[PDB]
Design a protein around this ligand. Structure first.
Ligand SMILES: [Mg+2]
Ligand SMILES: [Mg+2]
Ligand SMILES: [Mg+2]
Ligand SMILES: [Mg+2]
Ligand SMILES: [Mg+2]
Ligand SMILES: [Mg+2]
Ligand SMILES: [Mg+2]
Ligand SMILES: [Mg+2]
Ligand SMILES: [Mg+2]
Ligand SMILES: [Mg+2]
Ligand SMILES: [Mg+2]
Ligand SMILES: [Mg+2]
Ligand SMILES: [Mg+2]
Ligand SMILES: [Mg+2]
Ligand SMILES: [Mg+2]
Ligand SMILES: [Mg+2]
Ligand SMILES: [Mg+2]
Ligand SMILES: [Mg+2]
Ligand SMILES: [Mg+2]
Ligand SMILES: [Mg+2]
Ligand SMILES: [Mg+2]
Ligand SMILES: [Mg+2]
Ligand SMILES: [Zn+2]
Lengths: 187, 53, 159, 75, 104
RNA sequence: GCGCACCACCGGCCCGUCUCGCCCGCCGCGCCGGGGAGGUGGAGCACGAGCGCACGUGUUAGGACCCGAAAGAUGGUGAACU
RNA sequence: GGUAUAGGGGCGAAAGACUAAUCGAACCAUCUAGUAGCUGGUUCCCUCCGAAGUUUCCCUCAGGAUAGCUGGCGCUCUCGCACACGCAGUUUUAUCCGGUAAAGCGAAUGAUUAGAGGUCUUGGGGCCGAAACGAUCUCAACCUAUUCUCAAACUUUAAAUGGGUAAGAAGCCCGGCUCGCUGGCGUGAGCCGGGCGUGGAAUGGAGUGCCUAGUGGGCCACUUUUGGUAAGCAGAACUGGCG
RNA sequence: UGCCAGGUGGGGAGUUUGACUGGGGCGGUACACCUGUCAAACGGUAACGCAGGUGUCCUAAGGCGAGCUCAGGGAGGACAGAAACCUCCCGUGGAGCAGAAGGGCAAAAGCUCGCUUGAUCUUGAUUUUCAGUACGAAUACAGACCGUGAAAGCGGGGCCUCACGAUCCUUCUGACCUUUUGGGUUUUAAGCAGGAGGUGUCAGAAAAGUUACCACAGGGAUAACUGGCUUGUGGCGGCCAAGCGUUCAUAGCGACGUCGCUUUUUGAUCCUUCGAUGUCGGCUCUUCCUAUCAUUGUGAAGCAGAAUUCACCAAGCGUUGGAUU
RNA sequence: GUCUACGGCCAUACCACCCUGAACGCGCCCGAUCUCGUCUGAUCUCGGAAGCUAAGCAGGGUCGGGCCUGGUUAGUACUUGGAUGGGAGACCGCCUGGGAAUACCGGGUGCUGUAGGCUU
């Protein structure tokens, strides 16, 4: 008889990708070997992000990647993204960059190749930089999805700015008793 | 009964809607019949445009 | 069930002690309370304005805001599931400096002195506190006189 | 059909099951609840911090030079 | 309660404290053509009987007193409503009672 | 040292509203239009992430996991018993 | 035997009687699979985690919503990869809070027993007196020093147990800027630059975000405790169990 | 006659007839609030627990500044006495502060004066119940107009703990406010913001009874039996001994007190039973208990005999026939 | 040694009675034209310095009361945690730790900040 709680003994973190596509499985096997053998933690982070779901690796915009590469010191380094590189249309000047990503949009691929940059896959990254030396690891905005605007403190609560679940926004659908000082009260 | 922040929904299924359900299994047959009628009408006026005036 | 009165059950809590009624001493009125000062709240029945609630009596908090004759204190309060760090406005008469932090400040100053000193000496000094150790075995000298016998006293009914 | 009125028997176990937490203290607490005049003065002070920045830069450079000279003198 | 017939208080239009005339507010006429009244008249027409509730459980024995403050300054004449706590006896200029006299 | 994502805070911007104010323009100089500073209200901006399909769970409208009333309404049949 | 009266109708010397074995509203078909917060039932195995009968609101009390308890899915980090941040139904060292147990009423309020000294004060019966504070006691409410017994809605005192904080990097020590705030000079706050790291004991890897079922009749026991003569009675607090 | 309008209209139709509750009804509100206790020295904590109170009142009983000290007691002064007014002294508040109670207050927060309406207009933040949502109440601020005082300051109602109300609708107040739809002007109307008209079942339905002619879904969550815990009450038995007994407490009794037993009385509880356990009596029949009426064997006398009662082993055998109900 | 003005802690500072005060100072005290307010220059306000410690005030004394601080009461009352401890119960003892309050008996009877005087 030993008094130990078993409610938090099984950890919930992912061990393998839930997708059944085979190319991702091959990349997972390659980076499993690299992470379990090489002492580099970059391979561990890449493996963990490869295990992640669609919402856990949001797409990275071209403008954000350019701005991140604009920082001093990280010049002539390979961009590593485990998500998708998406074209940004409200930017004009695109420099030459070395990018590694699972997916690159056709517009983004064309603009990157036009500027003289290079686009590589993760199997090419393993051949080029097996330990991930001289690379900048980036990711998209995790809180970019519209679901997080509905998360947090409940609406109708003081000092809360959470979007309620409404069928349609309008004059007579909300903003009444509970939100108007003239109608009962407001929070 | 509401439960922890769901949308307020008002389905319009309070009448006897199952009596007046309109299926669309007739859609491919309808398209084939329309195409046959269109071809027959085009053939009837041999030199005139099939679209019309 | 009990009433929801604000001052219910404060018959003795918000009452001046014996032979200490009358004019409030002016020392409490002219003490400053900077931001980040640890302060313990004790209500006073003489002043009715700025009265803290009975649940904050005896609690200790930190000052974050100051007004002309009142300060804002953030005090932890447990409500049946959790501890809430909530901010209240309390007048000066119900506010006094807490002496819990001054001992720590004095020990910090002494440790800084012991760090600056004995550094060129080369001998490291013990800065951490330790609990009471064993009583450092010694000798007891019963010079001449023998120990006195203590026999139990026979019972007798006194009532 | 009278029933039980009120109790707090099993509540403590429920409270302590999910690790009753002291509120999470975070550095740089918010300024909500402070007197408006003091906030207005602080905002005006921060608004003009950029003014006279070259004086701060020159003083910092002079202090750095003095510190370097003192380090060289010590060595 | 007793309140005076004159009240020198703030005036929103003037922007300063001005003397005001004090009168008791009273309910007006329904005008027979409000949107709610027209809707109620249309709903009550026809068959079906009474369509809206009729309150029949009066409990309070007094109403809240409302004071009509009218600015006496010419070219302003701005009115304003002020409510005072409930009381069952109200008057204006009501017998300032001359504290310290003989009561008979 | 450059510092992803994210968190906390301090600033900035957009719309409504309140207070104090100084100026700008004209096709029509007016009960014209525009701008500032300081608080506040918004499901906002602040270099994006949605769309479509499929699967699972949870809440509903429907007969609604299955069986169960005392009732109500519409239209017809009975004085071969009494 | 023929004929007439048909269902909110008929008929009734009146029983709510009869109206095809049904009548305080007949039978047949349909609306209709009417509604039920109420009973009953609800179909294979193994593995893992694992509850509540509690707060608030509801014409709410055999029911719901809402917090609480539970599960699942993750994510952000640290590391027995010689090299640890942070948190605790714990204790220690400091520093605040209380008015219960106890005790007191020779201290306040209230209750209350009896003797000594008081025309303190006045008054009733009385006795020696026309009367007399002239002698003697007595009963009245009071006093002067004592004395017996009490208070959940009394208290000068006053525990054990208990409840907040502090035990450092988000801390200290210097230099300089900003302020439509406050000020005689000054404050106070906010911005930048520089220098100093095991801050009591022992144990834990932590933090954070979404959905989420069931529950919302409880009961018993040590201890404290309310009503009741008492109850395997009714009702509370802490902890532990059955459920 | 046809169509409108007003009255009448249980002849007829639809519907309603709250909740808590030591079963329900009746009785009360423990249904919305406040004070002390319960409550076990943070806080919070139940019962149809205890003692009470509230739906008001105040142009001053709000806000400033000044001046005094109250209740009570003693000593005195023409009428004048226990209480009329004046003087002196003692007086920690034993008075007063509107109310119920608690806390607090002495050159006040009480009394008397002088001036006023901070009981004014407007953004936010926080506290009480709390889900940490509203309402009410309150707390520190800030921006204008003020009041008062020489000034420091104080005041945006009452010294504090309570005295009150959502949606919809109506009504009033305000802007040289928006719309009033093809455009323009004018009435009207609809909006924006702030008050009021009210829901006492007080987070807020518009609501009378009876059914013994009754029905349905349930409930032993809930009553009327027995049976269970308890014994207040009923019944029965002891302990001490003031007295009755002509004398003498105990032959026979026994007050004032106190300790017990039984469930053959009525009570309290709701534990089993509401998909049903056939009730009050009487008749018939068996068995069991002793707290013994009689018989057998004995102890005691206010036992001379007879008779009588007290007590012991003791339930073997007996404890009847009728008028009334 | 000490006083005055403004104070801090608010009786070790209060209350009752008695004794002593050199100098400065604090007051008593002398009057109501001006300032001011009363039924009364009683209070307040103003104008002064003929007398005084009479009083306030300061110091000291009471086998003084009170107040503050100790011993006793007492390891008593009470109390955290424990037992298949005792007892019919009422209650009590023990183990492990903490630990009171009356009566009674001792000690003490204000320290101190700023500025300005006197004893030169
Ligand atoms: Mg066509
Ligand atoms: Mg009509
Ligand atoms: Mg859901
Ligand atoms: Mg059916
Ligand atoms: Mg019906
Ligand atoms: Mg009948
Ligand atoms: Mg069905
Ligand atoms: Mg129900
Ligand atoms: Mg698990
Ligand atoms: Mg398990
Ligand atoms: Mg006691
Ligand atoms: Mg169960
Ligand atoms: Mg009817
Ligand atoms: Mg009922
Ligand atoms: Mg108490
Ligand atoms: Mg407690
Ligand atoms: Mg005064
Ligand atoms: Mg103001
Ligand atoms: Mg009958
Ligand atoms: Mg039962
Ligand atoms: Mg009896
Ligand atoms: Mg005989
Ligand atoms: Zn005006």
């Amino acid at each position: 008889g030993v008094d130990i709680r078993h409610n938090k003994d099984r950890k919930v973190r992912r061990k393998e990708p839930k997708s059944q596509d085979i190319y991702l499985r091959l990349l997972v096997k390659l980076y499993r070997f690299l992470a379990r053998r090489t002492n580099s933690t970059f391979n561990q982070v890449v493996l963990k992000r490869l295990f992640m779901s669609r919402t856990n690796r949001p797409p990275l915009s071209l403008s954000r990647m350019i701005r991140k590469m604009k920082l001093p010191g990280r010049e002539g380094k390979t961009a590593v993204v485990v998500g998708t590189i998406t074209d940004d249309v409200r930017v004009q000047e695109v420099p030459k960059l070395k990018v590694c990503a699972l997916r690159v949009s056709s517009r983004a691929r064309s603009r990157i190749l036009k500027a003289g940059g290079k686009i590589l896959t993760f199997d090419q990254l393993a051949l080029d930089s097996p330990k991930g030396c001289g690379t900048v690891l980036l990711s998209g905005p995790r809180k970019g999805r519209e679901v997080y605007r509905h998360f947090g403190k409940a609406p109708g609560t003081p000092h809360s700015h959470t979007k309620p679940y409404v069928r349609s926004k309008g004059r007579k659908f909300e903003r009444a008793r509970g939100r108007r000082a003239s109608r009962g009260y407001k929070n | 009964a509401p439960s922890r922040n769901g949308m307020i929904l008002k389905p319009h299924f309070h009448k006897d809607w199952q009596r007046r359900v309109a299926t669309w299994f007739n859609q491919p047959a309808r398209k084939i019949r329309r195409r046959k009628a269109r071809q027959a009408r085009a053939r009837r006026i041999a030199p005139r445009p099939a679209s019309g005036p | 069930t009990n009433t929801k009165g604000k001052r219910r059950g404060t018959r003795y809590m918000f009452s001046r002690p014996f032979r200490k009624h009358g004019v409030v001493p002016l020392a409490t009125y002219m003490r400053i309370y900077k931001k980040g000062d640890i302060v313990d709240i004790k209500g006073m029945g003489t002043v009715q304005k700025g009265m803290p609630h009975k649940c904050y009596h005896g609690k200790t908090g930190r000052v974050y805001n100051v007004t002309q004759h009142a300060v804002g204190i953030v005090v932890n309060k447990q409500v049946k599931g959790k501890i809430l760090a909530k901010r209240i406005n309390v007048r000066i008469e119900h506010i006094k400096h807490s002496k819990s932090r001054d001992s720590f400040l004095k020990r910090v100053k002494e440790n800084d002195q012991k760090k600056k000193e004995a550094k060129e000496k080369g001998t490291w000094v013990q800065l951490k506190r330790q609990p009471a150790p064993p009583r450092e075995a010694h000798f007891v000298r019963t010079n001449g006189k023998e120990p006195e016998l203590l026999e139990p006293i026979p019972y007798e009914f006194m009532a | 059909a009278k029933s039980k009125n009120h109790t707090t028997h099993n509540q403590s176990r429920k409270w302590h099951r999910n690790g009753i937490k002291k509120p999470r203290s975070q550095r740089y607490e918010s300024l909500k609840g402070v007197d408006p005049k003091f906030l207005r003065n602080m905002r005006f002070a921060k608004k003009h911090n950029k003014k006279g920045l070259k004086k701060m830069q020159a003083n910092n450079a002079k202090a750095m030079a003095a510190r370097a000279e003192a380090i060289k003198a010590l060595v | 309660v007793n309140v005076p017939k004159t009240r020198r208080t703030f005036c929103k239009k003037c922007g300063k404290h001005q003397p005001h005339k004090v009168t008791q507010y009273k309910k007006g006429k329904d005008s027979l053509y409000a949107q709610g009244k027209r809707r109620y008249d249309r709903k009550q027409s026809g068959y079906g009987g009474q369509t809206k509730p009729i309150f029949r459980k009066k409990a309070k024995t007094t109403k809240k007193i409302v004071l009509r403050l009218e600015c006496v300054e010419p070219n302003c004449r701005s009115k304003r409503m002020l409510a005072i706590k409930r009381c069952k006896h109200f008057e204006l200029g009501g017998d300032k009672k001359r504290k310290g006299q003989v009561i008979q």
